[PDB]
């Protein structure tokens, strides 16, 4: 087999969208509230808020997303956001020092750093285990970006309305991945399954984060250190 | 005449409260989102949000404030906050370079800096004219701190309920000032009047800021750069 022109286009517009919303230099991080070693909460809130905007710009360039109703777009984004963030953050994750390295020693976050931002080992341990497994799948750019769009276009989210249209989108995308791997990836005949499972892991991870963020956001002394966008996206308004 | 022990105490607890809520080193400013030359909006929002917390800690130590109902305390704070900020900010204002200098060249804000945070000359011009006049009154520490507490305890604010109790507080404080000046300040027999007028100027200034903040906060691209506390205090919820 070989991919169709339509499939090929999808890959193209997706990879372009990724490059336009991911700055490999992390130079913008100097505009965040500085890291402090809940001393790390201001910087990581600034980090997540930044990533949410990037995740939004990415989604806007996914073929078909823009053509959903705003309600649905917000619904998909509000529930998949942290998963896209965990997914995209694999690019900065490093196995050699088991942390996310972002252009410097100040912007290197280990588990202990994130523990000073109000999270527990109950999240951070499966998260790092997740990032390693995902790292070990040695995904192509095309695969990485596909997987993220698949995650965005999951129809089993709370709040979606046109589940029929969103499922059609996700399937179209999965075919592109299942195909791509078959043709363009040597030695990956279990990979699709391995990626699908990575999605199932993200749901658990989403749940644990949501528990902990809920704990965090319920204390005004801490939620005041969050950002209006974070509060909007991770908050529970209908 | 000479001040009573009660008046003397009031002065004492007020000056102590000022020192506890004003860090003359401005070292905490390195924890704000950096200044950029609406490039200055993130840093000044971080600056104001910081000052609001200090203004709150100050008010908490004013004799009698703590004994009001929370409703009233919030009402007094929500409407006087920016005035206390303009008032307290005189301490960093400098006539030699016509700007607020806060420990460095990065933390030196002229009119042009604040114009990059979403404000117009319509505010910033009378503001600087205000800061100069106030600077020229060469207030004692005791007078400066009194004037701020008077401003906080104004009963003519929207939302106050026990205007009777708050007026009693403010008068008690004004007597302390009117007295202090008489006794402890040589050559200030017009000063009380000059300070009272400074209060009337602040109301105009409050109005102009409120117009402009309302303009600013109505644009999501800008309000997202503000902070949860700023939004709470300067926002209009009842």
């Amino acid at each position: 087999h070989m991919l169709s022109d339509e499939q090929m286009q999808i890959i193209n517009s997706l990879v372009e969208a990724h490059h336009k919303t991911y700055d490999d230099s992390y130079s913008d991080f100097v505009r965040f509230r500085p890291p402090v070693r809940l001393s790390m909460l201001p910087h990581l809130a600034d980090l997540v808020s930044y990533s949410i905007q990037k995740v939004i710009g990415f989604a806007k360039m996914i073929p078909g997303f823009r053509d959903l109703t705003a309600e649905d777009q917000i619904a998909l984004l509000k529930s998949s956001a942290i998963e896209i963030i965990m997914l995209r953050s694999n690019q900065s994750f490093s196995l050699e020092d088991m942390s996310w390295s972002c252009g410097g020693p100040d912007f290197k976050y280990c588990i202990n750093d994130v523990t000073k931002a109000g999270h527990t080992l109950e999240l951070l341990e499966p998260l790092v285990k997740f990032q390693v497994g995902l790292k070990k799948l040695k995904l192509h750019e095309e695969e990485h970006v596909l997987l993220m769009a698949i995650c965005l276009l999951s129809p089993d989210r709370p709040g979606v309305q046109d589940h029929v249209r969103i499922e059609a989108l996700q399937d179209r995308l999965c075919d592109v991945l299942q195909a791509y791997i078959r043709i363009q990836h040597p030695g990956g005949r279990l990979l699709y399954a391995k990626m699908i499972q990575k999605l199932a892991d993200l749901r658990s991870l989403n749940e644990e984060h949501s528990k902990q963020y809920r704990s965090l956001s319920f204390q005004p002394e801490h939620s005041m250190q969050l950002t209006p966008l974070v509060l909007e996206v991770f908050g529970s308004e209908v | 005449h000479m001040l009573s022990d009660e008046q003397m105490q009031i002065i004492n607890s007020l000056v102590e409260a000022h020192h506890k809520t004003y860090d003359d080193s401005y070292s905490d400013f390195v924890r704000f989102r950096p200044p950029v030359r609406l490039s200055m909006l993130p840093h000044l929002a971080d600056l104001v949000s910081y000052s609001i917390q200090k203004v709150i800690g100050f008010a908490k130590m004013i004799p009698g404030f703590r004994d009001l109902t929370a409703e009233d305390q919030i009402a007094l704070l929500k409407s006087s906050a920016i005035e206390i900020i303009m008032l307290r900010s005189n301490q960093s204002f400098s006539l030699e370079d016509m700007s607020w200098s806060c420990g460095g060249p990065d933390f030196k804000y002229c009119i042009n800096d604040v114009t990059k945070a979403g404000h117009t000359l319509e505010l910033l011009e009378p503001l600087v004219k205000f800061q100069v006049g106030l600077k020229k009154l060469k207030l004692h520490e005791e007078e400066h701190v009194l004037l701020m507490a008077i401003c906080l305890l104004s009963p003519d604010r929207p939302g106050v309920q026990d205007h009777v109790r708050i007026e009693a507080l403010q008068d008690r404080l004004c007597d302390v000032l009117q007295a202090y000046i008489r006794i402890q300040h040589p050559g200030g027999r017009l000063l009380y009047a000059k300070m009272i007028q400074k209060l009337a100027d602040l109301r105009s200034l409050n109005e102009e800021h409120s117009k402009q903040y309302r303009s600013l906060s109505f644009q999501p691209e800008h309000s997202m750069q503000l902070t949860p506390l700023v939004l709470e205090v300067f926002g209009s919820e009842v």
């Binding site: 905007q53 939004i56 806007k60 705003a70 777009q73 917000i74 984004l77 509000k78 209006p228 966008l229 909007e232 996206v233 308004e237 | 999501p220 691209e221 309000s223 997202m224």
Partner: peptide, 10 residues
């Protein structure tokens, strides 16, 4: 609600 998300979604 979601004032910011609506804007960011242009």
């Amino acid at each position: 609600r979601h004032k910011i998300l609506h804007r960011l979604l242009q």
